[PDB]
Amino acid sequence: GGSMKIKEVIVVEGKDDTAAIRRAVDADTIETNGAAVGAEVIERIKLAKERRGVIIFTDPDFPGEKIRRTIAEQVPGCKHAFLPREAAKARSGKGIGVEHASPDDIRQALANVYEE
C-alpha cells in the first residue's frame, strides 16, 4: 500500500506532465504550456505559492529549464524538483521527460525538495 500526497501546487509544462504526476502522487498541478506565460497564470501561481507553496517540475533540457527560470523570476520563493540523475538521462527509460518518468522517480524528485 502507501501513497504520497503533496501539499504544494506543482507547476508543469503540459497535460502529459500532469498525467505522469497523478500516476505517482495525489497533487494539484498548474500547466504553463510553455515559457510565454500570461499574467493571469503567474497570478494563480503566486496565490498558490503564498497559500500552499509551489514546486516547479520541468524537463531537464533547454525548453524545460527556460520555463523553470521564467517562473522562478516572476514568482519568488518557488521550490524546484528535479528527476534523479539516472532518470534524467536520455538513454535510460523512455527519455529525459517528466511525462515519461516512473512513479517512484517522480516521488523521489518531489521528496528531494524537503529537508527531512
PDB file of C-alpha atoms in Angstrom:
ATOM      1  CA  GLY A   1       0.000   0.000   0.000  1.00  0.00           C
ATOM      2  CA  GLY A   2       1.041   3.581   0.750  1.00  0.00           C
ATOM      3  CA  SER A   3       0.586   6.865  -1.074  1.00  0.00           C
ATOM      4  CA  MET A   4       2.216  10.293  -1.248  1.00  0.00           C
ATOM      5  CA  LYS A   5       0.093  13.451  -1.036  1.00  0.00           C
ATOM      6  CA  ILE A   6       1.706  16.765  -1.980  1.00  0.00           C
ATOM      7  CA  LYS A   7       0.623  19.980  -0.268  1.00  0.00           C
ATOM      8  CA  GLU A   8       2.304  22.327  -2.760  1.00  0.00           C
ATOM      9  CA  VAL A   9       0.853  23.004  -6.188  1.00  0.00           C
ATOM     10  CA  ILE A  10       3.140  21.528  -8.842  1.00  0.00           C
ATOM     11  CA  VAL A  11       3.859  23.789 -11.819  1.00  0.00           C
ATOM     12  CA  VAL A  12       4.488  21.783 -15.003  1.00  0.00           C
ATOM     13  CA  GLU A  13       4.534  22.323 -18.743  1.00  0.00           C
ATOM     14  CA  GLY A  14       1.657  20.307 -20.157  1.00  0.00           C
ATOM     15  CA  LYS A  15      -1.022  17.672 -19.931  1.00  0.00           C
ATOM     16  CA  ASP A  16       1.302  14.657 -20.107  1.00  0.00           C
ATOM     17  CA  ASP A  17       3.347  16.013 -17.214  1.00  0.00           C
ATOM     18  CA  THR A  18       0.173  16.260 -15.136  1.00  0.00           C
ATOM     19  CA  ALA A  19      -0.752  12.707 -16.117  1.00  0.00           C
ATOM     20  CA  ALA A  20       2.633  11.284 -15.116  1.00  0.00           C
ATOM     21  CA  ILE A  21       2.466  13.160 -11.798  1.00  0.00           C
ATOM     22  CA  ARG A  22      -1.050  11.937 -10.994  1.00  0.00           C
ATOM     23  CA  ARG A  23       0.074   8.346 -11.628  1.00  0.00           C
ATOM     24  CA  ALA A  24       2.627   8.887  -8.817  1.00  0.00           C
ATOM     25  CA  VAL A  25       1.117  11.229  -6.196  1.00  0.00           C
ATOM     26  CA  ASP A  26      -2.041  12.977  -5.067  1.00  0.00           C
ATOM     27  CA  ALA A  27      -1.278  16.531  -6.142  1.00  0.00           C
ATOM     28  CA  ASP A  28      -2.714  19.586  -7.841  1.00  0.00           C
ATOM     29  CA  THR A  29      -0.930  21.000 -10.883  1.00  0.00           C
ATOM     30  CA  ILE A  30      -0.820  24.183 -12.940  1.00  0.00           C
ATOM     31  CA  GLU A  31       0.207  23.815 -16.588  1.00  0.00           C
ATOM     32  CA  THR A  32       2.105  26.642 -18.237  1.00  0.00           C
ATOM     33  CA  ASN A  33       2.006  25.271 -21.805  1.00  0.00           C
ATOM     34  CA  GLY A  34       5.386  26.916 -22.436  1.00  0.00           C
ATOM     35  CA  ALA A  35       7.552  29.771 -21.222  1.00  0.00           C
ATOM     36  CA  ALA A  36       5.384  32.619 -22.573  1.00  0.00           C
ATOM     37  CA  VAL A  37       3.102  32.801 -19.537  1.00  0.00           C
ATOM     38  CA  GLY A  38       0.375  35.401 -19.147  1.00  0.00           C
ATOM     39  CA  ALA A  39      -0.060  37.474 -16.008  1.00  0.00           C
ATOM     40  CA  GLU A  40      -3.198  35.520 -15.092  1.00  0.00           C
ATOM     41  CA  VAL A  41      -1.304  32.222 -14.808  1.00  0.00           C
ATOM     42  CA  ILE A  42       1.519  33.957 -12.923  1.00  0.00           C
ATOM     43  CA  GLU A  43      -1.090  35.329 -10.523  1.00  0.00           C
ATOM     44  CA  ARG A  44      -2.552  31.854  -9.951  1.00  0.00           C
ATOM     45  CA  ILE A  45       0.952  30.503  -9.277  1.00  0.00           C
ATOM     46  CA  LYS A  46       1.694  33.364  -6.874  1.00  0.00           C
ATOM     47  CA  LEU A  47      -1.522  32.778  -4.925  1.00  0.00           C
ATOM     48  CA  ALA A  48      -0.778  29.049  -4.739  1.00  0.00           C
ATOM     49  CA  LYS A  49       2.781  29.794  -3.578  1.00  0.00           C
ATOM     50  CA  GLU A  50       1.524  32.072  -0.819  1.00  0.00           C
ATOM     51  CA  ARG A  51      -1.173  29.655   0.382  1.00  0.00           C
ATOM     52  CA  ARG A  52       0.299  26.178  -0.106  1.00  0.00           C
ATOM     53  CA  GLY A  53       3.745  26.528  -1.635  1.00  0.00           C
ATOM     54  CA  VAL A  54       4.705  25.752  -5.227  1.00  0.00           C
ATOM     55  CA  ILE A  55       7.081  23.164  -6.683  1.00  0.00           C
ATOM     56  CA  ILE A  56       8.262  23.726 -10.260  1.00  0.00           C
ATOM     57  CA  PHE A  57       8.924  20.430 -12.080  1.00  0.00           C
ATOM     58  CA  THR A  58      10.028  20.678 -15.734  1.00  0.00           C
ATOM     59  CA  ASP A  59      12.145  18.709 -18.197  1.00  0.00           C
ATOM     60  CA  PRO A  60      15.964  18.787 -17.890  1.00  0.00           C
ATOM     61  CA  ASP A  61      16.518  20.291 -21.346  1.00  0.00           C
ATOM     62  CA  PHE A  62      16.709  23.865 -22.578  1.00  0.00           C
ATOM     63  CA  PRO A  63      12.952  24.494 -23.073  1.00  0.00           C
ATOM     64  CA  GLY A  64      12.052  22.898 -19.723  1.00  0.00           C
ATOM     65  CA  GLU A  65      14.738  24.903 -17.949  1.00  0.00           C
ATOM     66  CA  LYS A  66      13.541  28.077 -19.660  1.00  0.00           C
ATOM     67  CA  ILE A  67      10.078  27.546 -18.155  1.00  0.00           C
ATOM     68  CA  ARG A  68      11.680  26.933 -14.771  1.00  0.00           C
ATOM     69  CA  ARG A  69      13.752  30.151 -14.888  1.00  0.00           C
ATOM     70  CA  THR A  70      10.785  32.169 -16.167  1.00  0.00           C
ATOM     71  CA  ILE A  71       8.532  31.137 -13.283  1.00  0.00           C
ATOM     72  CA  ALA A  72      11.289  31.462 -10.674  1.00  0.00           C
ATOM     73  CA  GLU A  73      11.928  35.068 -11.716  1.00  0.00           C
ATOM     74  CA  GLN A  74       8.254  36.040 -11.711  1.00  0.00           C
ATOM     75  CA  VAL A  75       7.237  34.199  -8.504  1.00  0.00           C
ATOM     76  CA  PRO A  76       9.868  34.387  -5.755  1.00  0.00           C
ATOM     77  CA  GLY A  77      10.113  31.509  -3.336  1.00  0.00           C
ATOM     78  CA  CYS A  78       9.013  28.617  -5.527  1.00  0.00           C
ATOM     79  CA  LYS A  79      10.626  25.274  -4.846  1.00  0.00           C
ATOM     80  CA  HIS A  80      12.250  23.181  -7.563  1.00  0.00           C
ATOM     81  CA  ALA A  81      12.087  19.432  -8.168  1.00  0.00           C
ATOM     82  CA  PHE A  82      14.417  17.547 -10.498  1.00  0.00           C
ATOM     83  CA  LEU A  83      14.447  13.978 -11.733  1.00  0.00           C
ATOM     84  CA  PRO A  84      17.207  11.844 -10.173  1.00  0.00           C
ATOM     85  CA  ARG A  85      20.381  11.652 -12.251  1.00  0.00           C
ATOM     86  CA  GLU A  86      19.701   8.226 -13.743  1.00  0.00           C
ATOM     87  CA  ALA A  87      16.096   9.007 -14.698  1.00  0.00           C
ATOM     88  CA  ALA A  88      17.146  12.309 -16.320  1.00  0.00           C
ATOM     89  CA  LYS A  89      19.394  10.548 -18.849  1.00  0.00           C
ATOM     90  CA  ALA A  90      18.244  10.383 -22.452  1.00  0.00           C
ATOM     91  CA  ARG A  91      19.379   6.748 -22.729  1.00  0.00           C
ATOM     92  CA  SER A  92      17.641   5.499 -19.559  1.00  0.00           C
ATOM     93  CA  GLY A  93      13.988   4.527 -19.650  1.00  0.00           C
ATOM     94  CA  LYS A  94      11.993   6.332 -22.332  1.00  0.00           C
ATOM     95  CA  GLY A  95      13.935   9.588 -22.206  1.00  0.00           C
ATOM     96  CA  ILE A  96      14.539  12.671 -20.114  1.00  0.00           C
ATOM     97  CA  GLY A  97      10.996  13.981 -19.763  1.00  0.00           C
ATOM     98  CA  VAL A  98       8.792  14.257 -16.696  1.00  0.00           C
ATOM     99  CA  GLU A  99       5.975  12.867 -18.852  1.00  0.00           C
ATOM    100  CA  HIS A 100       7.906   9.593 -19.212  1.00  0.00           C
ATOM    101  CA  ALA A 101       9.088   9.246 -15.603  1.00  0.00           C
ATOM    102  CA  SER A 102       8.118   6.260 -13.470  1.00  0.00           C
ATOM    103  CA  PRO A 103       6.047   6.835 -10.301  1.00  0.00           C
ATOM    104  CA  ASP A 104       8.968   6.222  -7.976  1.00  0.00           C
ATOM    105  CA  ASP A 105      11.235   8.606  -9.920  1.00  0.00           C
ATOM    106  CA  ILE A 106       8.608  11.343  -9.692  1.00  0.00           C
ATOM    107  CA  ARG A 107       8.210  10.670  -5.968  1.00  0.00           C
ATOM    108  CA  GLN A 108      11.986  10.854  -5.464  1.00  0.00           C
ATOM    109  CA  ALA A 109      12.135  14.183  -7.320  1.00  0.00           C
ATOM    110  CA  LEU A 110       9.407  15.606  -5.092  1.00  0.00           C
ATOM    111  CA  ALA A 111      10.784  14.091  -1.875  1.00  0.00           C
ATOM    112  CA  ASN A 112      14.131  15.764  -2.535  1.00  0.00           C
ATOM    113  CA  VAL A 113      12.573  19.241  -2.246  1.00  0.00           C
ATOM    114  CA  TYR A 114      12.150  18.710   1.511  1.00  0.00           C
ATOM    115  CA  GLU A 115      14.936  18.964   4.068  1.00  0.00           C
ATOM    116  CA  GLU A 116      13.663  15.957   6.045  1.00  0.00           C
TER     117      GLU A 116
END
